[PDB]
Design a protein around this ligand. Structure first.
Ligand SMILES: [Ca+2]
Ligand SMILES: [Ca+2]
Lengths: 69, 351
C-alpha cells in the first residue's frame, strides 16, 4: 500500500506537462517509453478504463484507483 | 574535451572527472545535477585524494596548508575563531569518525598542491618551509613544512609561543588515504525509457506485453488493458524509486543514504569513469532529493543527457525541469520542499 506522497511522485511521471490530468497524449508517450507501441484506439481504451467520471482524462483520484488495483 | 565553457570551470569539478560525467549522462540518458564543488578540493580530487562519506561530520578546513582536508584538530578547521561549544561539539565529530574505520593520518602535500596553495594566496609565502599567511589563524598558530624522500611535504604545526611542532593530523580512509569534500549530486533525472526492462520484470516475466499474453493465454481487450496499466504503474514506480527509497543502501560498510536503483547505477558508472582517470570514488551518496536536511545552495550545475552543461539559478531551474519533463525525463523532489514553500512543481500537489 503506497502512501499519498509515493502515489503523487508516480503521478508526476505520467502528468508530464503542467496540469494535474493525464491526457491521452501523455499516456501514449509513457506507454512507448515503457516499450509498447499503441494505436490511438488502444490509448483511448486505457484512458477509458481508468476514466471514472468520463471527462476524457485521468485525474489524481482516478489514478489512485488505477494504482490500488 | 575537458572544459567547454564557463559553467564547466565554475563547477569546481576537475576536468577529467567531468568528462566521464558528461559521458555517463549520455550513456545512461539522464540529466545529472550537482552542487558546486569548493574550489579548494578540485585539485585534491584530481590527483586521487579520497572523498568523504556521510559518516564524516567533521568540519573541513578552508585555510592554511591544511585547506581542503579535514583536520583532526578542530581549530585548524574552518571553525577557527569559534568558541567553546562549537570548537567542543567539533571534537566528538572528529572523534565520531575515527570510531568507524577512519584513521588519522599525517598531512603531506604533493609539490603540485603546494604550488596551487601559494598561487591561490592561501599561503602568502614561506621561508623555504616557515610558511606565512594573513588568515586569523596564524596569529594563534605556527606552521612549517618538511620535504621527504617521496617528493611530498610534511606539514607540522605549533601554538604561538607554546613549544614543539607536531605533524598536522588529518582524517582518512580505512585504507589510510586522506579525505576531501565529495561531489554532491543535486538530483538525477532519468529518461522514462530507462525503465522498460525494469517494468517488464516486475510484471511480465521480463517480456513484452504481446509476447506475455501469447505465452500464457490461447487464441475490448480487458485482460490486455489491465497488463498495460500494470506496466505503466511499474515503470513510474521504478523511475521514481518508490520502494528503494524506503530503506538505506550501503556500499560495503559505508551508508550511502536513500537512493534509487538508477541513482546508484549512476553513482557506480561515475565512480568508474573517475577511476579511469586518476581519481578515487567521488560520489559517495545519493542525491539531494533525499537529503533530510536540505541545502538552499543556490546555483546548481547541470549536465544534460545531450552533454551540454550549464549553471542555473533556482528560477531557471524550474523552467529547466519542466522543459525536460516535457521530453520524458522524470523528476521527483525532496519531500520537504512543499511544506516549506520551495517546491519545483506548479501543479495540484494535492489529492
Ligand atoms: Ca497533463
Ligand atoms: Ca476523468
Amino acid at each position: 500500500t503506497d502512501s499519498e506522497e509515493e502515489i503523487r511522485e508516480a503521478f508526476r511521471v505520467f502528468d508530464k506537462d503542467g496540469n494535474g490530468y493525464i491526457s491521452a497524449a501523455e499516456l501514449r508517450h509513457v506507454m512507448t517509453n515503457l516499450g509498447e507501441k499503441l494505436t490511438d484506439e488502444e490509448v483511448d481504451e486505457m484512458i477509458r478504463e481508468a476514466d471514472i467520471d468520463g471527462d476524457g482524462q485521468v485525474n489524481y483520484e482516478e489514478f489512485v484507483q488505477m494504482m490500488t488495483a | 574535451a575537458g572544459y567547454a565553457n564557463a559553467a564547466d570551470r565554475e563547477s569546481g569539478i576537475p576536468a577529467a572527472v567531468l568528462d566521464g560525467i558528461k559521458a555517463v549522462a549520455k550513456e545512461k540518458n539522464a540529466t545529472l545535477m550537482f552542487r558546486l564543488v569548493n574550489p579548494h578540493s578540485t585539485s585534491l580530487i584530481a590527483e586521487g585524494v579520497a572523498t568523504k562519506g556521510l559518516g564524516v561530520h567533521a568540519k573541513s578546513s578552508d585555510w592554511g596548508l591544511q585547506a581542503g582536508y579535514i583536520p583532526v584538530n578542530p581549530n585548524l578547521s574552518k571553525l577557527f575563531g569559534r568558541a567553546p561549544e562549537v570548537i567542543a561539539r567539533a571534537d566528538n565529530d572528529v572523534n565520531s569518525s575515527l570510531a568507524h574505520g577512519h584513521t588519522a593520518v599525517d598531512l603531506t602535500l604533493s609539490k603540485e598542491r603546494l604550488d596551487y596553495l601559494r598561487q591561490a594566496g592561501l599561503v602568502t609565502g614561506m621561508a623555504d618551509g616557515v610558511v606565512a599567511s594573513n588568515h586569523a589563524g596564524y596569529e594563534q598558530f605556527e606552521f612549517r613544512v618538511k620535504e621527504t624522500s617521496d617528493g611530498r611535504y610534511a606539514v607540522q604545526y605549533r601554538r604561538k609561543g607554546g613549544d614543539d611542532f607536531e605533524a598536522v593530523k588529518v582524517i582518512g580512509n580505512a585504507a589510510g588515504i586522506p579525505l576531501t569534500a565529495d561531489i554532491d549530486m543535486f538530483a538525477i533525472m532519468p529518461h522514462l525509457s530507462n525503465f522498460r526492462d525494469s517494468a517488464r520484470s516486475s510484471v511480465t516475466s521480463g517480456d513484452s506485453v504481446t509476447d506475455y499474453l501469447a505465452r500464457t493465454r490461447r487464441a475490448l481487450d480487458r485482460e490486455r488493458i489491465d497488463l498495460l496499466w500494470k506496466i505503466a504503474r511499474a515503470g513510474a514506480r521504478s523511475a521514481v524509486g518508490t520502494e528503494a527509497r524506503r530503506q538505506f543502501r550501503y556500499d560495503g560498510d559505508m551508508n550511502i543514504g536513500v537512493i534509487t536503483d538508477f541513482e546508484l547505477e549512476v553513482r557506480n558508472a561515475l565512480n568508474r569513469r573517475a577511476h579511469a582517470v586518476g581519481a578515487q570514488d567521488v560520489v559517495q551518496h545519493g542525491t539531494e532529493q533525499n537529503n533530510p536536511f536540505p541545502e538552499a545552495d543556490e546555483k546548481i550545475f547541470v549536465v544534460s543527457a545531450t552533454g551540454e552543461s550549464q549553471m542555473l539559478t533556482r528560477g531557471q531551474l524550474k523552467e529547466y525541469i519542466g522543459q525536460q519533463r516535457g521530453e520524458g525525463y522524470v523528476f521527483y523532489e525532496n519531500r520537504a520542499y512543499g511544506v516549506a514553500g520551495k517546491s519545483l512543481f506548479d501543479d495540484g500537489l494535492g489529492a
